[PDB]
Copies of this chain bind each other. A is one copy, B any other.
Amino acid sequence: DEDGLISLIFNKKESDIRGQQQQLVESLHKVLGGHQTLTVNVEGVKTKADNQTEVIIYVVERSPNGTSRRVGASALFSYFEQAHIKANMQSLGVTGAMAQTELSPVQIKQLIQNPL
């Protein structure tokens, strides 16, 4: 979870993603609120189909004391799945998202008991 990796599927060709990567990364930064304490990093880009591309990201957050660390994957996924944020993501061409952290049974039970 500490590695903070979120996989995003885009309904865009790989060449289009790479061709405008600066813009894509900044738009993701804007979705996060645009503060200078958050930085979006691209871990990888992979074609999945003619017009489907997976983009793996993480977000580095800086503390008031200058320390930096990655936003945990579960925390970042939780933000992106919020209805308002998901809609903004869909406007960028995102059609899905996944975190790598395998949740514990108690975490899963909590999510089922409180799906919202």
Identify the A interface with B (CB < 8 A): 63-69, 103-107, 109-110
Expressed in whole angstroms, the minimum distance between the Cβ of A6 and any Cβ of chain B is 18
CB < 8 Å neighbour of A106 from B65, B107, B109: B65
* Copies of chain A in the complex: 2
Contacts of A67 in B (CB 8 A): 104-107, 109-110
Complex Cα distance, B61 from A106, in Å, reads 11
Complex Cα distance, B103 from A104, in Å, reads 29
Complex Cα distance, B67 from A110, in Å, reads 7
Expressed in whole angstroms, the minimum distance between the Cβ of A103 and any Cβ of chain B is 7
Contacts of A106 in B (CB 8 A): 63, 65-69
Interface-central residue, A66, A107, A109, A110, by most chain B CB under 10 Å: A66
Interface-central residue, A64, A67, A104, A110, by most chain B CB under 10 Å: A67
Complex Cα distance, B104 from A63, in Å, reads 9
Expressed in whole angstroms, the minimum distance between the Cβ of A84 and any Cβ of chain B is 24
Expressed in whole angstroms, the minimum distance between the Cβ of A71 and any Cβ of chain B is 14
Contacts of A109 in B (CB 8 A): 67
